[PDB]
């Protein structure tokens with residue numbers, strides 16, 4: 433069993449009101465769905481990612497990351513976001529992340545292809 | 558079949574000499590392995606991600622992203638990188654990406670948890 | 683007079699307990715000092731930057747950015763941070779920012795030269 | 808005299824065909840102008856920044872950063888870019904950078920306020 437398999441698995445909410453539902457596998461897998469409260473998005477989108485299933489025991493958080501491609505049965509925003517961050521357990525559990533959102537562009541517009549931001553996920557909104 | 562399922566699937570090399578081997582599924586899945594030429598890494602690491610299986614037909618690239626957690630049978634660097642970018646087909650096919658590498662840290666060191674960079678992947682090194 | 687010359691000029695504090703003291707000039711200049719509560723830093727460091735002295739009047743924030751090179755009379759951390767963000771006026775005035783911290787490295791270590799994060803600045807801590 | 812005062816001062820060109828003209832002061836100052844080959848920009852824009860005037864002598868590059876607010880006598884793009892990077896001397900001198908471009912936005916659009924990219928500057932294009 434991954435050290436934080438149980439801690440990570442479940443439903444998380446960010447500061448924008450988005451919903452991230454994930455299952456963490458014993459050997460580092462992350463599968464789930466993401467629903468964005470903002471942007472060119474509707475309903476749930478597949479996500480997959482990875483996490484460190486054997487983190488340091490020194491009080492450090494647990495490194496993880498995942499991707500959503502913004503295509504589902506309702507919409508295609510020709511874009512993909514990746515979240516990179518760490519899970520922190522305890523009464524105030526939180527997944528703190530930075531993210532990159534890249535659109536498909538022409539070569540001429542590629543300089544402006546990628547947004548950066550930060551999302552913090554909590555178990556209760 | 559994803560528009561670029563065939564274009565994406567295969568072996569890619571970046572400017573550092575890293576090797577990314579990926580299979581793109583018809584409905585947006587990315588699975589594979591990553592071997593880093595640099596950092597606290599040895600041999601192959603699992604990766605998963607997503608791509609836009611129906612990109613714009615206007616000459617735009619194809620949005621995609623993936624994650625590696627830097628734990629395998631040889632090492633655990635308590636970290637995860639996500640690559641966010643776009644695939645561009647044609648004689649000079651390339652996956653252009655920006656990435657975020659987050660380590661597990663204490664809360665005191667969390668301000669310095671995350672590296673950012675950029676990798677460009679080609680079919681021949 | 684810059685629209686937010688008065689709003690921006692003064693002392694700001696971030697979530698880490700750092701202190702940013704800045705003067706905004708009528709034609710877009712930012713000068714001041716920065717004192718970091720964290721990292722390889724002691725006392726004040728020079729900063730300079732720029733801001734949009736004629737922002738949109740539609741309720742948008744005011745774009746701005748500044749740099750600190752982490753060399754002063756006490757220390758040299760061979761690094762520089764740039765903050766890019768927007769100032770938002772009103773009872774809850776805030777400067778919201780993302781930042782890049784680049785160290786001087788050898789070419790071999792250049793892939794790991796740059797940290798990314800986010801600071802939010804307030805008028806009262 | 809800053810170690811790389813002479814090396815940095817002058818005209819640089821990036822991969823997009825932009826022109827950066829800068830003067831480095833003996834005590835870490837950077838002043839100059841920037842002309843973008845892309846985006847909502849015309850002619851030169853003021854820039855200011857900082858650099859490490861006493862870098863490591865171990866072959867490491869020289870940390871530096873600067874800002875442009877995208878307002879001049881011709882246009883106002885209500886935005887500011889900061890470049891964070893390192894200067895590398897020698898026959899192939901280069902300033903390697905990552906950058907953040909923040910627009911002024913409403914609070915509702917703030918999640919999409921900031922672009923990230925990377926520019927490499929050379930002495931000859």
Ligand SMILES: O=C(CCCC[C@@H]1SC[C@@H]2NC(=O)N[C@@H]21)Nc1cccc(S)c1
Nearest residue numbers: 450468471472473502509511513535919
């Ligand atoms: O809008 C989308 C799809 C939805 C993005 C949701 C973002 S993902 C990071 C953040 N965290 C959340 O929970 N929501 C937001 N793509 C797109 C394409 C072209 C230009 C632009 S600006 C945007």
Ligand SMILES: O=C(CCCC[C@@H]1SC[C@@H]2NC(=O)N[C@@H]21)Nc1cccc(S)c1
Nearest residue numbers: 575593596597598627634636638660794
């Ligand atoms: O070193 C690792 C594991 C290997 C990273 C490989 C990077 S991933 C982006 C880039 N692209 C490549 O192909 N290779 C590089 N983690 C780690 C932990 C704590 C502090 C630091 S500085 C680094």
Ligand SMILES: O=C(CCCC[C@@H]1SC[C@@H]2NC(=O)N[C@@H]21)Nc1cccc(S)c1
Nearest residue numbers: 669700718721722723752759761763785
């Ligand atoms: O430590 C420093 C100097 C102080 C940085 C202060 C940062 S600036 C962004 C953030 N916002 C604040 O208020 N404080 C923090 N440079 C350095 C060199 C080599 C490796 C590393 S990891 C770090």
Ligand SMILES: O=C(CCCC[C@@H]1SC[C@@H]2NC(=O)N[C@@H]21)Nc1cccc(S)c1
Nearest residue numbers: 544825843846847848877884886888910
């Ligand atoms: O277009 C501008 C002003 C010119 C940016 C030039 C960039 S700065 C980084 C890069 N390096 C260069 O040399 N050129 C490019 N701002 C703006 C406002 C709202 C939305 C968007 S997408 C863009």
